[PDB]
Write a protein that binds this ligand. Sequence first.
Ligand SMILES: *CCC(=O)N[C@H]1Cc2c(N)cccc2N(c2ccc(C(F)(F)F)cc2)C1
Ligand SMILES: *CCC(=O)N[C@H]1Cc2c(N)cccc2N(c2ccc(C(F)(F)F)cc2)C1
Lengths: 212, 215
Amino acid sequence: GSHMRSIGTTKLRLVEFSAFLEQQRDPDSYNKHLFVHIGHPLLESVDIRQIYDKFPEKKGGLKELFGKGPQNAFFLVKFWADLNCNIQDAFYGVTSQYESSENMTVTCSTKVCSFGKQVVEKVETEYARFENGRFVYRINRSPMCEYMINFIHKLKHLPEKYMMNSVLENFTILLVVTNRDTQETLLCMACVFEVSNSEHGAQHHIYRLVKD
Amino acid sequence: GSHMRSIGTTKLRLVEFSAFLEQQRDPDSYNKHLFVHIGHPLLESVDIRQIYDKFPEKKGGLKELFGKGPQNAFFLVKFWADLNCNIQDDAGAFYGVTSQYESSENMTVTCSTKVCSFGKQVVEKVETEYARFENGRFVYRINRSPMCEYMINFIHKLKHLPEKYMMNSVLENFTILLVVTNRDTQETLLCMACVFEVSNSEHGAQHHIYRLVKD
Ligand SMILES: *CCC(=O)N[C@H]1Cc2c(N)cccc2N(c2ccc(C(F)(F)F)cc2)C1
Ligand SMILES: *CCC(=O)N[C@H]1Cc2c(N)cccc2N(c2ccc(C(F)(F)F)cc2)C1
């Protein structure tokens, strides 16, 4: 069953994350819609054996990554996406911010999966910047992959939330941040999705990934 | 008369600047309005003697800074601000500034913004930033620096004016001196003497950069 406890200490902390659509009305006016967001503790656990088939397995996959550890850097992130927006013609992007006490060069790998099979992998490397006593790794306007744009358009062409949930059930993202110089895994977020029913918009719940 | 030519080599390059107001409609919906922007050549010149009275003078002032040089890092920036936006009061609004500078050197950079009313400093904002190595050069980015309270109330007062010619008249006595310095050496990397009017263009905010020269 669930095991609820603190993370402890990780070398890298995710502080902010957002996936958005920004549409220009005129050169001085921009409307932004957030699909999901984090950052705008005791954590429960999810057994990794409950999610193996939803993520790429075999060479370089989730079970192999988890076996190499450190296991306290592995999490399952549930998202409740906000698809309530009007798509017209626009920048689909992602923001993120990580922090660490160590100056590192980090590589972020985002793998988009369909039925547990990798369809896209985006790879971005970022050097550290010292700010207010720590090292910060911030990406301001990282473009979404083409697959995501078409997937969002597909979701919005469905009349009801239960239909969007059925499409989202087999869509996952595996986000892995690695120290480029040593190849150590700094953070791994296994992301699952559903549509948000809340009037407060997008929601999320983070769990620790455990094997027992 | 104007002297029109290239800037030459500088240790720091301005790549982007904007002043904005961002308003939350709900936790997932935001609108952003740009008052001014840059980065979204042969430059003409302005006699620095024509602006001495509009900026801070004496110790640390424009004349002293220009004298110390490098003179090719000093510019007059004329802005035509876009004030066509709702004023958001008590509703989750952020009045801010973004900027991005780039260099081949790894430096610690300090940005000093002095707001002047009738040639006299009403606010000085000082912010220090470290470099990030990106795409083969050093990048100095500020994405969400808060505007000073003076600016927020001043923007609110301008917007209430019935005609653009009245906003231009108030703006004749408002200037901003932006000085970017290498924190460790005190060398002036960039100095922008900013003057303002309100835009009449259907394309929104506009700007023109001039090199400051002596004679
Ligand atoms: C190839 C780039 C890409 O797929 N970007 C996505 C990355 C991402 C991450 N890392 C975590 C959570 C969400 C997202 N993104 C995303 C997922 C789902 C939606 C949707 F529910 F609205 F469809 C939008 C965006 C972007
Ligand atoms: C104290 C902080 C502050 O005043 N921020 C301003 C900085 C700035 C700079 N450095 C250059 C150009 C414009 C601005 N800012 C600004 C000036 C004028 C307007 C207005 F015309 F709309 F009134 C808005 C913002 C912000």
